[PDB]
Symmetry: C2
Subunit: 289 residues, 2 copies
């Protein structure tokens, strides 16, 4: 049976116009929403959430279509899995709890939801943290031979359905575990709690969840990119106080996108809250308090 990795946290299934959002909820104090990325679920925050819960009301949510959140039906523009749409849905969910102004930290896809939210609806956020990302526009602008080989999955998972879905079907466990291992410092699964890996594996084993992940990357290649392109070619900057953390220039990039940003490296591969939970929790606690 899948483990409870958030001792003493409650659970909520929050209704929205686009479907329910699952979350674990703990602590007390100013509200802080935590958003995971790919190929993970809310449980990736399990090593830093208890520390944060000592000072904040912590809401640990599954992204639209991920984990135990509902999977809204997609369309030809991948609309519900665009970061603009995901941000709107999570804004609705937070209003159900009575939170109209809150702190936000995101990792990977969740971080993309977070900066898009800040660009579209800055009034919703007191402060923003993004973990191991640059804006989607910047990833695509950097596209050349070396990058194309290094993060091939941005273009692979974005191929029209059912191409990646059919490739992922034969042996999903192998793909999701190889990706998890690939982006860590050690290149294996040693950084992860095995109980957390099982959450990720069970999610990836559902073809409907895998289809959502592909719709997310299709949005990442198309509408998300176009939304970002508008902002950069207008010189729009996030006005929300912001923190950028990254694993082993990023601050120079984010300074183009944000007018009040600070940043620091964290000695980690990609999965900062699992690979470097102590440094990551300290950074987030310091910034948000």
């Amino acid at each position: 049976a899948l483990a409870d990795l958030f001792p003493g946290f409650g659970s909520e299934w929050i209704n929205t116009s686009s479907g329910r959002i699952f979350a674990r909820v703990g602590g007390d104090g100013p509200p802080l929403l935590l958003l995971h990325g790919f190929p993970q679920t809310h449980v990736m925050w399990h090593r830093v959430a208890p520390k944060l819960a000592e000072r904040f009301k912590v809401i640990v949510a599954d992204l639209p279509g991920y984990g135990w959140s509902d999977m809204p039906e997609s369309d030809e523009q991948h609309t519900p899995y665009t970061k603009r749409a995901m941000a709107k849905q999570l804004i609705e969910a937070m209003e159900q709890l009575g939170h109209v102004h809150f702190a936000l930290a995101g990792h990977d896809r969740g971080a993309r939801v977070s900066y898009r939210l800040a660009l579209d609806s800055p009034g919703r956020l007191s402060k923003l943290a993004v973990l191991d990302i640059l804006p989607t526009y910047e990833y695509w602008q950097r596209m050349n031979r070396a990058y194309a080989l290094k993060i091939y999955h941005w273009s692979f998972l974005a191929q029209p359905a059912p191409l990646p879905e059919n490739l992922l079907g034969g042996d999903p466990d192998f793909y999701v575990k190889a990706k998890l291992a690939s982006w860590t410092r050690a290149g294996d699964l040693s950084a992860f709690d095995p109980r957390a890996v099982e959450h990720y594996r069970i999610a990836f084993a559902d073809p409907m969840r895998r289809h959502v992940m592909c719709e997310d990357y299709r949005a990442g290649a198309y509408a998300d990119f176009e939304h970002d392109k508008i902002d950069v070619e207008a010189g729009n900057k996030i006005p929300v106080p912001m923190l950028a953390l990254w694993g082993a220039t990023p601050l120079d990039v984010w300074r183009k996108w944000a007018s009040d940003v600070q940043g620091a490296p964290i000695e980690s591969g990609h999965f900062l809250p699992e690979e470097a939970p102590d440094q990551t929790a300290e950074a987030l606690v310091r910034f948000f308090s």
Copy 2:
């Protein structure tokens, strides 16, 4: 599996790297035809007869493709580099007593062919390349748009066993979708069903798929480096050359790479000899005559 070359013999040709399979027909000046991915020598079955009216036509499976032997690869993918493939096919042609011949290639085979022309121009009387630009150029062009359009250049080049593992779940689906996707029609209707079965049978073998991935790995690394040396040195192919391409700039590009080249678009997707056999055969006959 059907015989699609009436009158042509079937030969296994020995080389220091393993046997090359070919269908051989006609009489007159020697002409070698080289297929690409994900196909075999049979892709020439519509145009080979018209060519055999005027030439001795040798329709070869690339090293590691079709019925040709599969030499053991290595960490630099050496035997599936276009330089090595060209050396192996020069050995095969010497077994037939052909040390100066005409050459037409398509896709991967066209990449073997222009590399052969750069390394060993004395081997060729005339050169035709079908629906390609040099490997260097395609990588120089690899921005967001190209990363999405030719994603398989980066996907198939990922370190083993990532693409081998994915391709094993439903190879028939993948190969048939590639064939369809790259035609003007967007379905399999331009192909002879017997030809498609040859392609499917080949692609069903894990060892053959592994060769294909080694070919794309060479394409991302050593083939690119070999081409880069020539571009920087200003080396041009001196062999009289024809560039044909599917209409669904190329002559402008090839003129940077060759000092004597003609070219034309064909009303066709990628698979010229099957989608537009009459126009392709006429262009080739007129050129090589």
